[PDB]
Amino acid sequence: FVEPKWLCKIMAQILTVPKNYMTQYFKLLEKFQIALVPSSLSDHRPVIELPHCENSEIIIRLYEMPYFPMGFWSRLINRLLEISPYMLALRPNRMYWRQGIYLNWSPEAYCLVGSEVLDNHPESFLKITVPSCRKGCILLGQVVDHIDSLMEEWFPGLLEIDGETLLKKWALYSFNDGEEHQKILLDDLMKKAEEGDLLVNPDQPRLTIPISQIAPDLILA
Amino acid sequence: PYNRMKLMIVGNTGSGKTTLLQQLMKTKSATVGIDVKDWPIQIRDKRKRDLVLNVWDFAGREEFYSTHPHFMTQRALYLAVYDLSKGQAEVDAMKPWLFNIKARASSSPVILVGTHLDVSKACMSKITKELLNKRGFPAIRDYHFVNATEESDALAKLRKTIINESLNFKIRDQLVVGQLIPDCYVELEKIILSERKNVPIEFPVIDRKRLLQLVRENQLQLDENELPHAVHFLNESGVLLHFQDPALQLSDLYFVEPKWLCKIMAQILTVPKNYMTQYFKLLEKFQIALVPSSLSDHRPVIELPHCENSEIIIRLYEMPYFPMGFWSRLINRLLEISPYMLALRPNRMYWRQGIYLNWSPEAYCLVGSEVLDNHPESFLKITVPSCRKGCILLGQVVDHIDSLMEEWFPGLLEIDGETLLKKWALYSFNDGEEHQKILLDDLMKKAEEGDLLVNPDQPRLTIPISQIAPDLILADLPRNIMLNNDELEFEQAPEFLLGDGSFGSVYRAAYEGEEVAVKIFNKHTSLRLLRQELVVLCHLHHPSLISLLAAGIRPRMLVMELASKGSLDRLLQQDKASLTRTLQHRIALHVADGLRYLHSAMIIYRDL
Numbered sequence: 030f031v032e033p034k035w036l037c038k039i040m041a042q043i044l045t046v047p048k049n050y051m052t053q054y055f056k057l058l059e060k061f062q063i064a065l066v067p068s069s070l071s072d073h074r075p076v077i078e079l080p081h082c083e084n085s086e087i088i089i090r091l092y093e094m095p096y097f098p099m100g101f102w103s104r105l106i107n108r109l110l111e112i113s114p115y116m117l118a119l120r121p122n123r124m125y126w127r128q129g130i131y132l133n134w135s136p137e138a139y140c141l142v143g144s145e146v147l148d149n150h151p152e153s154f155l156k157i158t159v160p161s162c163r164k165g166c167i168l169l170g171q172v173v174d175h176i177d178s179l180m181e182e183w184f185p186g187l188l189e190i191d192g193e194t195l196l197k198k199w200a201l202y203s204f205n206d207g208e209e210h211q212k213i214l215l216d217d218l219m220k221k222a223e224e225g226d227l228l229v230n231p232d233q234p235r236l237t238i239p240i241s242q243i244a245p246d247l248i249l250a
Numbered sequence: 251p252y253n254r255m256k257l258m259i260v261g262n263t264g265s266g267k268t269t270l271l272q273q274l275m276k277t278k279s280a281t282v283g284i285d286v287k288d289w290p291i292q293i294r295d296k297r298k299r300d301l302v303l304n305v306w307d308f309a310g311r312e313e314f315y316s317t318h319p320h321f322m323t324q325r326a327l328y329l330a331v332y333d334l335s336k337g338q339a340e341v342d343a344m345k346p347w348l349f350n351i352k353a354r355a356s357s358s359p360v361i362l363v364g365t366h367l368d369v370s371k372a373c374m375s376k377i378t379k380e381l382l383n384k385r386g387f388p389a390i391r392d393y394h395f396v397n398a399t400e401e402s403d404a405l406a407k408l409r410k411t412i413i414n415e416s417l418n419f420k421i422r423d424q425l426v427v428g429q430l431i432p433d434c435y436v437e438l439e440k441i442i443l444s445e446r447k448n449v450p451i452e453f454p455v456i457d458r459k460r461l462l463q464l465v466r467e468n469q470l471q472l473d474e475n476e477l478p479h480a481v482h483f484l485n486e487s488g489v490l491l492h493f494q495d496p497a498l499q500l501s502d503l504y505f506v507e508p509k510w511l512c513k514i515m516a517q518i519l520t521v522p523k524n525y526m527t528q529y530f531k532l533l534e535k536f537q538i539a540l541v542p543s544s545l546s547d548h549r550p551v552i553e554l555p556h557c558e559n560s561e562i563i564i565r566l567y568e569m570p571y572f573p574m575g576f577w578s579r580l581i582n583r584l585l586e587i588s589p590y591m592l593a594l595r596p597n598r599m600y601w602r603q604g605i606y607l608n609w610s611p612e613a614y615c616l617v618g619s620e621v622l623d624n625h626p627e628s629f630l631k632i633t634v635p636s637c638r639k640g641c642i643l644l645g646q647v648v649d650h651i652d653s654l655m656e657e658w659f660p661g662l663l664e665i666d667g668e669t670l671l672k673k674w675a676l677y678s679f680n681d682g683e684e685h686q687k688i689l690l691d692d693l694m695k696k697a698e699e700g701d702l703l704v705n706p707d708q709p710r711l712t713i714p715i716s717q718i719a720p721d722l723i724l725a726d727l728p729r730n731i732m733l734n735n736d737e738l739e740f741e742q743a744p745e746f747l748l749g750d751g752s753f754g755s756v757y758r759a760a761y762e763g764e765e766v767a768v769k770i771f772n773k774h775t776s777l778r779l780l781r782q783e784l785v786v787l788c789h790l791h792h793p794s795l796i797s798l799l800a801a802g803i804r805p806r807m808l809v810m811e812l813a814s815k816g817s818l819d820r821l822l823q824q825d826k827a828s829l830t831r832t833l834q835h836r837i838a839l840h841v842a843d844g845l846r847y848l849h850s851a852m853i854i855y856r857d858l
């Protein structure tokens with residue numbers, strides 16, 4: 030491509046609306062993240078009543094950052110497009126919007142990534158919900174690896190240590206027996222340093238939780 | 251004579267209703283709820299029939315539309331005001347309302363009223379006289395171009411027309427305005443009207459004990475067993491509202507002064523510590539609770555697992571518009587009450603016009619409005635996988651929708667015959683690879699039950715009617731049950747082979763070499779009753795309940811095991827000596843075991 034302003038203008042032409050290069054046109058249209066148009070995806074979370082409530086049947090992980098980078102969700106959705114299967118086959122149900130994916134195989138083999146906003150917190154979050162079963166652990170591993178790879182490849186400044194690091198990965202655990210609520214949130218690096226044992230324990234050590242059912246990407250689960 | 255009738259003032263937002271009403275009753279702010287009132291018309295003619303219309307000034311704004319179909323009845327006259335100012339398009343903007351008057355109250359008059367005559371476009375009578383007269387619409391009987399905010403010969407003629415058109419109602423020559431009632435009913439109405447004043451304004455509700463105390467404290471001779479009929483009749487006339495249904499805990503509370511109830515319930519759609527639970531119960535009864543309205547109206551992209559025309563089953567439902575609270579009642583009805591198995595909670599993704607329950611990549615179900623090109627009508631496409639669990643889901647969903655239509659919107663099924671609701675079934679002779687599923691009206695396919703296949707002009711192609719409409723052929727049930735008609739040896743016509751006299755239409759036949767008792771459920775009725783009985787019977791499996799052998803569509807029949815010694819009643823009549831103490835005990839034990847198993851499945855065997 031010589032004279033790049035023409036390429037850039039032509040590629041951005043369709044976001045407001047040579048018979049040989051149609052296929053190359055579509056290929057580089059996907060390379061610019063224009064193709065299913067990832068932009069204009071209604072921006073509105075559709076109500077989703079997951080099969081599994083109960084703090085002892087789902088695994089949550091957050092991803093905190095001051096704002097989502099510009100083309101973050103587009104590249105993420107494109108990256109997660111059926112490239113994260115529970116098994117090693119079956120095509121899953123998928124319900125995209127501008128800030129989420131929600132692949133869903135079965136009532137025990139689903140995965141919902143998607144922005145979730147909290148009260149009294151101007152930051153942005155990327156809560157990931159996943160069932161506690163084996164297939165769930167597999168999905169959580171794949172999703173976390175894809176996100177981490179995207180961050181390291183496109184937005185390096187979000188990982189540069191000065192140290193708030195501008196990206197604090199949380200892991201939501203609930204000592205509260207699953208019945209009670211308000212999952213205590215623990216920074217991921219602290220739990221990594223808590224790999225010496227295989228459990229987490231509160232001030233009252235009668236309670237305990239295995240680190241597998243909190244962050245099964247650290248312990249090889 | 252009961253001189254009381256409901257006048258309902260329907261219309262769109264901003265068009266003059268409360269101002270027209272203030273000038274109709276000469277009674278010299280956006281409506282919230284339905285704003286009930288009542289004005290008495292003292293007719294000065296020789297027939298000085300002092301009638302009392304109770305008006306219902308319906309709110310035009312859309313957010314309240316979910317609760318309006320609860321307050322649209324037959325024994326009522328309708329107005330329909332439509333703001334002449336924005337002419338030629340405000341008439342085409344109130345066609346939904348007229349279609350809804352048609353669906354809910356199919357035989358009630360409608361007096362079109364064009365307000366805003368001061369500003370401007372009176373040639374809107376053209377579209378009124380061409381498109382709005384008889385093409386699927388609720389029998390318009392007068393049309394006035396009136397002003398509001400001032401009385402004149404226009405409003406005078408409009409008021410006189412309301413009076414006349416009220417008195418001459420005559421549903422099947424009945425003259426609603428002057429029918430007869432037991433005098434105790436009007437006495438009860440007068441004591442209720444007096445109780446309207448002596449009740450706290452913050453809570454006008456009255457208690458069933460307070461009503462009993464009131465009817466006893468005066469000379470009203472209404473017995474306790476008579477009160478339901480009376481209070482329900484006063485309910486129909488819009489005096490007091492009440493809900494005798496025991497599913498709710500409200501039957502002890504009788505809503506007097508209904509305008510307060512309606513306003514209070516619609517209060518939360520714009521935003522007494524004892525009745526919090528009852529509050530929520532009747533909030534769900536009005537379809538307010540998860541708020542089914544304000545559900546973002548935007549279909550979220552859904553990439554189903556299964557493309558390919560030979561792996562999904564489609565069914566449409568065509569109608570000119572969706573009725574007012576249609577999708578709300580439907581979503582509420584489909585709320586996990588349609589499981590693939592007979593357990594597991596499925597994933598659910600609601601929006602304002604869809605549900606999409608989803609168990610597995612082969613056990614999903616997506617109901618939801620789908621709009622087509624070059625078709626102003628509305629559709630209710632239902633997608634479902636072709637497997638067994640899919641067939642089960644399609645059966646349940648179709649039955650729920652059909653039930654809702656027959657219960658709430660009867661006018662959408664009344665045959666004149668376009669019928670205003672044409673259920674399609676999408677089949678694809680195109681081998682599944684190719685596309686453009688040929689659409690076949692369901693009734694035509696029902697008449698194609700003589701065979702078990704559909705065949706095109708080129709009969710080399712064929713499709714089994716199971717993989718098109720498995721609710722007609724008995725495939726939606728578990729445990730495929732058709733009776734292999736080659737092995738049945740039934741003879742219907744002779745009374746020779748009646749199972750016995752007065753067992754219904756149960757006959758005797760020999761199926762697969764053994765004698766069986768075959769009930770002929772065939773009649774003018776549809777497969778509703780047969781499929782209901784087959785669903786109930788298909789999963790019982792107890793040694794003290796009659797076992798199901800087969801079922802057939804040609805004709806509609808049931809095949810069950812044959813009890814050789816007949817019913818117990820005949821034994822008690824004919825051979826009393828055959829019963830001994832051991833046999834009597836065994837019969838009692840077996841019937842007790844049967845009832846025990848039924849109650850273990852939460853089923854009530856009505857009479858025994």
Ligand SMILES: Nc1nc2c(ncn2[C@@H]2O[C@H](COP(=O)(O)OP(=O)(O)O)[C@@H](O)[C@H]2O)c(=O)[nH]1
Nearest residue numbers: 264265266267268269281310365366368397398
């Ligand atoms: N000039 C004029 N104004 C009208 C007429 N009818 C209604 N309006 C205006 O329309 C408004 C009526 O609002 P309303 O119908 O009560 O709203 P609704 O309760 O939602 O139906 C008032 O502000 C009136 O001034 C009319 O015939 N002539």
